[PDB]
Structures are given as structure tokens and as C-alpha cells.
Assembly symmetry: D2
Homo-oligomer: 126 residues x 4
């Protein structure tokens, strides 16, 4: 079992660091890596809104700054600690680093990433 | 009721315009708008690869340059005319402009975008 | 000489099509292509703000949907017709399609893109 | 007053973490924060190339995961340790967090970000 309480808690803590002067919408994420460490991320607004960095992308950056590996589970929350589903961009980028079986926290029942992004674009297409 | 042969054909034609010096992976897309017009897009490489524009995003730019509206159906194909599933980013972008019932071409049977991006991040989360 | 009045006017018209329910910040752009046609673009918000498409990127999509070519001059304006400098992302993407000598409209004196993005990242680095 | 040898070295070390199966172009970056700590980042390819994360953006994610603050100096290098100029997107992102006086390493003499992104798009435009 994944310690979802621990991941959700770490995601919430991460959200406190969000840089959101324009969106005012803090987001945090935390992921369990296959070596057992946890990496975290928060969103980062830009004045050109289309250059905004998602919390889940920040998690992926942290993954490869701290030794690499594969993601096993991820929780994403807003500033109030409510669980959020990743945006489509983040689903694709998370898939690169945890695949279809990466588990994504959900208010009712955590979901396989493969269910959140079925028939995904990928290597087979290139 | 959607002429998929027509949409797929226009997507194929669109792919011929692809700017792909670095990726060498041409993609074209075409979508039926709710006023009955068809809009098209192709991918555009950048030397900083993360600034690459997807065909499906190009379709959405075209949508709003030609009078706006809602997308009803989209086909995306590679340089060989083979049907591609949109990347996660494009699934999120297309959802904004066609919603869950937007149909996405597929080699077997076209799919609702809602099935390709379930429990999507959205307005309720902000 | 570039007909800046004409480009600025076309950029302003393009801004009217902006999809900006979240940012409320309409942007339009228009560019002269080296075959003499003008292509236009507007910005497109997404609920995931980081998937927002810039007007200038939309111009580049239009370029390669309408026969390709090179950009000679570009004007970008807000919803009030005031001239805007492109964001850094757009400077890089415009550079791919017009190079250092692409002229960018400015309230006082249009500027070479090479001056707006000096010592640019590019092919030499790859 | 900035130890460029130290920053360049940490950037080089950061590049070793790069996730670059598709681009094969490793990039690392390191920045001095105004509390005196150093944060690092590396690039991260995605199979949809337009979702690639730049090293410099990874630095900004790290900044806000480690207490926030302002960037004073940044070095960016390739896999061979050669100094790279940031792409336009990254120039805009870095400007948000270090402003015009943020120093950017360069093979000849480090440059003010204000000189690398003059007349930048910003808060005044919104
Ligand atoms: Zn996201
Ligand atoms: Zn895409
Ligand atoms: Zn822009
Ligand atoms: Zn960059």
C-alpha cells in the first residue's frame, strides 16, 4: 500500500511554497520514487501565463535533480489541501517517468495514470 | 454524421505543411467546427524543443482566428496519414474548446474526448 | 518600408478573436510573410494557465497552415490596440521563422528581433 | 563577487542528471539565491517534445521548493560543460525570479538578464 496520508501531507506542505501572484491558485505535489524517497513540487506563475510551471512538472524536475528513477505514486493538492487531478500536460509528462501504473491520488479512490490518460501518445508513434 | 474520411484527408493535407527540421515527425490535424467549417493545423518544431507547437494546438489557434466557436470532431495524423492520439497537453487544450463530447478520430472507432481525458482538471478546481 | 499601420490594424482586428475568459487580456498579432501575405493570430487561454497559447505562436501556426515561408515583420497589440513586446518564449519561436532581422513593432521605433533576443540559443548549440 | 567557477561546476554536475533519451542534449543549470544557497536543474525530454522542461525552469521549480527568494546569478551548461545562453522562454521565466540584474554566465563575460531580454514583456502590460 502507498501511504497516501503521507504523500498528501507532503503535497500540502509543498503548496505553501507556490509562486502564484497572478493566478492566486497554489498547487503542491509530492511523489514516491522507486528508491523510497519522496520528491515535491509547487506551481510557479509567470507574467506570460503560458510559461506557468505546474507542480507535477516541478516534481519531475526534482526527480532528475535528486538521482533520477521512476515515480510510483503521486498526490496533487490545492492550497486548501483538496486533491486535484493533474492537467493533461502533466498526465503526459508523468507518464514518461512512471508509466501507466503510476498511481495518482483521488478524493475517493487513487487511479492508475493509464486510466487517466488512456491510449496515450508515445514512443510507438515516433 | 461526421465525415471522418474528409477530416482525416484534411488532416493529412495539413501535415504536409509541418515545420519539422529537428523532430522529422510531421503531424497534421483538422477539426469540424459547430458552424460547419473545417480548420486545420500542423506541428512546428523549435530549436528549443519545449517550445514546439502541436498540430492540435494550431487547430485551436485557427479556430479563434476564423470566428471562434466550438469543436465537434477532430482527426490527427502523422506524415504517413496514420491516425494519432493527441498528447495529454493537447487533450487539455482541446477540452477547453470542444468539451467531453468532442470526438477524436481513432483507427478502430472515434472516441469521446471525455474518455481520453477522464476526470479532467477544470473550472471547478479554480 | 513596412506598412506598420496596416500590420498594427490587422493585429488589432485579430485581438478581437482572443479567447481570454480567465486572463481577460486579449492579444492580437499580425505578420508580413516574404511572399507578401499577412497572417494573424490571437491568444488562447486554458484553464491550466500554463497551456495558454500566445498570439505570436498562433501567427507561426498560421504561417505553416498557409504555405510556409519566412516572417519579415510582426506587430503585437493588446485589446486596446497598444503595441506589446513579445514574451521571451515568443521571441525564440519567432526567431525560428524570421531570424535576427525580423522586425517587431514598437510604440516608438520598430526593433530587429536580434536586438530583442541577442546571443540567442540555437542550432550552433545543438 | 559571484563565484562563477563554483556555479559553472554545479551546473555541469546538474547536467549529468538530464533526462534526454530523445534529444540527446543534456543541459544543467545552477543559480545563486539571495540567501546564499545554490539551486540546480537539468532538462527533461518528453515524447511529445513540446512538453520538454528546460534546466533553467527546473532551477526555478527548485527555488520555490527550497524556500523561495530571488535569483542573483545563474550558469547554464551543456553535457560537455560549455556555457549556453538560455532560450527565450527561460529568459522570461528567469526574469520573474531575478529581474533585469540577474547575471547570466557567458564564455566571455557574464551578462545582465536585462541585456539578454530588453524591453521585456511584463506586469505593466497586463
Ligand atoms: Zn499541469
Ligand atoms: Zn500535443
Ligand atoms: Zn508570448
Ligand atoms: Zn529554455
Amino acid at each position: 500500500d502507498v501511504d497516501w496520508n503521507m504523500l498528501r501531507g507532503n503535497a500540502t506542505q509543498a503548496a505553501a511554497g507556490a509562486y502564484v501572484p497572478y493566478s492566486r491558485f497554489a498547487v503542491g505535489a509530492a511523489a514516491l520514487v522507486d528508491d523510497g524517497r519522496v520528491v515535491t513540487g509547487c506551481n510557479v506563475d509567470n507574467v506570460s501565463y503560458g510559461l506557468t510551471l505546474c507542480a507535477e512538472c516541478a516534481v519531475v524536475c526534482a526527480l532528475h535533480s535528486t538521482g533520477g528513477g521512476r515515480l510510483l505514486a503521486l498526490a496533487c493538492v490545492d492550497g486548501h489541501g483538496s486533491v486535484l487531478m493533474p492537467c493533461g500536460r502533466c498526465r503526459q509528462v508523468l507518464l514518461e517517468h512512471g508509466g501507466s501504473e503510476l498511481l495518482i491520488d483521488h478524493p475517493v479512490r487513487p487511479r492508475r495514470l493509464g486510466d487517466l490518460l488512456p491510449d496515450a501518445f508515445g514512443l510507438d508513434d515516433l
